[model samples]
Target: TMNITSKQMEITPAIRQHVADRLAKLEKWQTHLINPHIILSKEPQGFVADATINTPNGVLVASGKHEDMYTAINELINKLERQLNKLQHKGEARRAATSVKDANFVEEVEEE
Candidate 1:
């Protein structure tokens, strides 16, 4: 589940629904995802959106700004997706290396 906060702006039902839909897809990416927070704000340049995803592995943050709130939201999602991909890629590489390093392990059995 995701908690959303809007600063100096009111969030409409449509926007809230849109965010919820997007987050549902994100939830499937990692099983250990804990409290996820999304903050939206009106900025001088445009609208700004920020997201923080907390997982057992670590925490990830992404932010975006655009002329429209929807656009900002889309960009934020894309950034978050990229960060997650990178993090997962590194984790997979590390796991592969660890497995390779342990591949030569030998087990000894004691006979009674």
Candidate 2:
């Protein structure tokens, strides 16, 4: 998580909590993810939230700028979800090819 440092702009505990809470949902996609770097910044338009999640498959990034902090966060989260879902689909496809049943089946013998 990244904290914004600017003139008279300091990170608050509430913001930290909100960020943690927002990011906690990402655990659901842990199998396809490594760690996410979140950057919250103050913009002229409003607040901008950017997130980059690194995974074994690839890298995904989400960014949004909105007048409301919550709105920006929501937008970025939606993008991140879409990216994760896409990666999950790709990962599933790759794994499907290796799970086929083998041909080396052993026949059972009749017991006396």
Candidate 3:
């Protein structure tokens, strides 16, 4: 689940729905995810969107600014996806290394 907050603008149903849909795409990696927060703000220059996701492994944060709020949201989400993939790959690599260590230990013990 994600919590979205808006600043200097009304949070419309369309915006809420879009945020929910985009966040749902992240459920595949939710095992370690504790909390996800998204903040949308309207500035004089542009719209700003930022997201922070807390996981058991670490915290990932990303921010984007664009003339269109939707575009800003999309950019931030892409950043989060990249971070999530990196974390997943790191975990997988650790598991593979552990498996190799265990296999080597077993083979050495058998030969002895």
Candidate 4:
């Protein structure tokens, strides 16, 4: 949902459409999320995109304050991408460690 208000800029239909378009990219990761809270604010610099996407793993947050609204949206999306990347790397490390344990189990099974 949109918790939106206007400041110097009017929150027009075009702006709302733009926000929806930008947010649509989150659909790719939405399956892993519980609820999505998006707060779009008009800051002195520009538009600030703050998204709190609660996922099964943890609360994934991406916020970007930029001089341009579209750029801010892109930045926040990139931030989420980076967060996903970090999670992927961390999970890979855990899987690699588990594979080492699996090797011992495999050896024991072979002995039987």
* TM-scores of the candidates in the order shown: 0.72, 0.60, 0.71, 0.56
Of the candidates shown, which would achieve the greatest TM-score relative to the real structure?
1
Model 4 steric clash pairs: none
**In model 2, what are the clashing residue pairs, if there are any?**
none
lDDT of 4 by residue, 21-97 (tens): 75576565444665565556676667887777777788788888898876776687678777877775744333563
Clashing pairs in 3: none
Worst lDDT window (10 residues) for model 4?
Answer: 1-10
lDDT (Cα, tens digit) per residue for candidate 2, span 29-59: 5575565676777777798888787777678
**Model 3 spans with C-alpha error above 4 angstroms:** 90-112
Candidate 1: stretches off by over 4 Å: 90-112
Ranking by lDDT: 3, 1, 2, 4
Instruction: Return whichever of 1 and 2 wins on lDDT.
Output: 1
Q: Compute the lDDT of residue 33 as modeled in candidate 3.
A: 62
How much is the lDDT of residue 94 in candidate 4? 38
Ranking by TM-score: 1, 3, 2, 4
Weakest ten-residue segment in model 1 by summed lDDT: 103-112
Residues 1-112, candidate 3, lDDT per residue (tens digit)? 6678886777777887887787777777557767688899878888999988887777899999988988999888889887777775744333563545444565686567
